[PDB]
């Protein structure tokens, strides 16, 4: 019930954010014309954060 569900959801979210952050680093400093880097921006929706 309650808190434990929130904790498993939070840990899953945290793990996904971290893995994305690791993938994200391999793409730093890639030169394509005037583009110099690429990222996958991950964010949490407010209506679900509250």
């Amino acid at each position: 019930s309650s808190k434990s569900v929130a904790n498993i959801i939070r840990k899953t979210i945290q793990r996904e954010q971290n893995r994305i952050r690791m993938l994200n680093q391999g793409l730093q400093a890639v030169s394509f014309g005037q583009v110099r880097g690429v990222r996958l921006n991950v964010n949490v929706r407010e209506s679900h954060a509250i």
Binding site: V5, I8, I9, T12, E16, I20, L40
Partner: peptide, 9 residues
């Protein structure tokens, strides 16, 4: 595409 689906929840 980028996120795996998790059954545990």
């Amino acid at each position: 595409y980028l996120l795996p689906e998790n059954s545990g929840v």
